[PDB]
C-alpha cells in the first residue's frame, strides 16, 4: 500500500496534553510555526545545494521552497493582524532528533533524509487537524488550508524517496523513523513548540 | 534618491568579458542558474540573521520566491538546449564584496544591503550588454530579467535607507563602488556571470 494514509503512516496521534498547552499559548505556537515554514524553505534549499546534480529533487525542492515561503509570509500577516510581536524562539528538539537517525553513506543518506521529511510533513498535517476544532474561525480556516498542503508534501517527499531508493530499504527506514518520531511526540518536553512532546 | 544603473555603477561591462561569455554560453547559463539560487539562499540567510526586522523579512521572503522562479526558468532553458548539470564553482565577485562589510551593527546590515544593490545593478547592466549579441530566445529571456534586476537594485537600496543614515550609506556606496569596479575591470582566470576580464 504505497504512500499510506496519514494516521496509518504515523506511529501515534497528537496527545491531548500537547493540545491543551498549545491552546494556552497560541502566540509562541504561531511564532514557532512561522519559523517552521521558513526552516522548511531553507532545508529545501540546502538539499538543492547538497544534491545539485539530482534534477528531479532540484525542481521539486525549488517549487516546495516557494510554497513554504508563501506560508511563512501568511503566518507573518496573521501575526501582524492579531498584534503578535516577533521575538526569538529557538528551534525545538524534533527535526534534529529525527536527523540523527539519518545514515552517513550515499545514496542511502538521501533516501533517509527524504523519509524524515515525509514524517515531519505527515505530523504537521495530523497536528493541524487535531488543532482546528479548538481554534477561532480565521485561524481554523488558515490551518485547514495548510493541512491539505502538508498532505501533498508528505506524498511528495515519499514519492521522491522511492525515486532514489529500493522498496525494502525505504520500508526499513520508515519503520525506524516511525518509532523515533513517536518517542519525540509522546515523551515529555520542557518547552512548547509546534512539534514538541507533552509538557 | 535611486540613481540610474550606469550612474550607480563604477564601469561598464568590458567588451572582452562579452567576447568570452559568447564563446562559452553553457558555462554562463549554469553559473546564471547558480546565481539565481545563491540570491534566494542569501535572502533566506538575511531573514535568519535579522529575524525580528519585519520590513527586511517580508521583502526578503518575496525576493527569494522571485529568485527561485528564475532559478527554475534557467533550468528549463538548460533542459531545452542540452546543457548538462555540471558543477561550476562560485566566482570571486560576491565574496570579494562581502569582505568589505563591517562586523558591527546596525552598520553591518546597511553594508550588506548596499552590496546587494551593487550585485543586482551589475546583473541588470550586464544582461543588457549581452541581449543584443544572443539568439532570439536567450535575448528575450535575458531582456525580461532586466526589469526585475533593476527593481531588486531599487529594493535593496531603499531598504538600506530604511536602516541608515544618508551620509553613512553614501560613504558605504562610494567604497563598494570602488571595489566592485576593481572586481569587474581586473583580470580573472575563470568565466562567470560576474567574472573580471579574461587572462
Ligand atoms: Ca558609471
Ligand atoms: Ca551537450
Ligand atoms: Cl512564488
Ligand atoms: Fe508549509
Ligand atoms: Fe509543508
Ligand atoms: Fe534573479
Ligand atoms: Fe535579482
Ligand atoms: Kr495557533
Ligand atoms: Kr504550526
Ligand atoms: Kr508547521
Ligand atoms: Kr548565456
Ligand atoms: Kr546572473
Automatic annotation (TrEMBL), chain A:
Species for this entry: Pseudomonas putida (Arthrobacter siderocapsulatus)
CDD domains cross-referenced by the UniProt entry: MiaE
Positions of Fe(3+) 1 binding: 37, 68, 71, 150
UniProt superkingdom: Bacteria
Molecular function, one GO term: metal ion binding
Keyword list, A-Z: Calcium, Metal-binding
Protein name: tRNA-(Ms[2]io[6]A)-hydroxylase
Binding site for Fe(3+) 2: 68, 121, 150, 153
Pfam family, one: MiaE
Protein residues bound to Ca(2+) 2: 20
Biological process per Gene Ontology, one example term: tRNA modification
Positions that bind Ca(2+) 1: 7, 10
InterPro entries: Ferritin-like (IPR012347), Ferritin-like_SF (IPR009078), tRNA-Hydrxlase_MiaE (IPR010386)
Automatic annotation (TrEMBL), chain B:
Binding annotation for Fe(3+) 2: 67, 120, 149, 152
UniProt: Fe(3+) 1 binding residues: 36, 67, 70, 149
Keyword Metal-binding attached: yes
PANTHER family named in the record: TRNA 2-(METHYLSULFANYL)-N(6)-ISOPENTENYLADENOSINE(37) HYDROXYLASE, TRNA-(MS[2]IO[6]A)-HYDROXYLASE
MF term (GO), any: tRNA 2-(methylsulfanyl)-N(6)-isopentenyladenosine(37) hydroxylase activity
Metal-binding as UniProt keyword: yes
Entry binding sites for Ca(2+) 1: 6, 9
Alphabetical UniProt keywords: Calcium, Metal-binding
Residues bound to Ca(2+) 2: 19
InterPro entries: Ferritin-like, Ferritin-like_SF, tRNA-Hydrxlase_MiaE
Annotated protein name in UniProt: tRNA-(Ms[2]io[6]A)-hydroxylase
A Pfam short name: MiaE
Biological-process GO terms, alphabetical: tRNA modification
Source species of the chain: Pseudomonas putida (Arthrobacter siderocapsulatus)
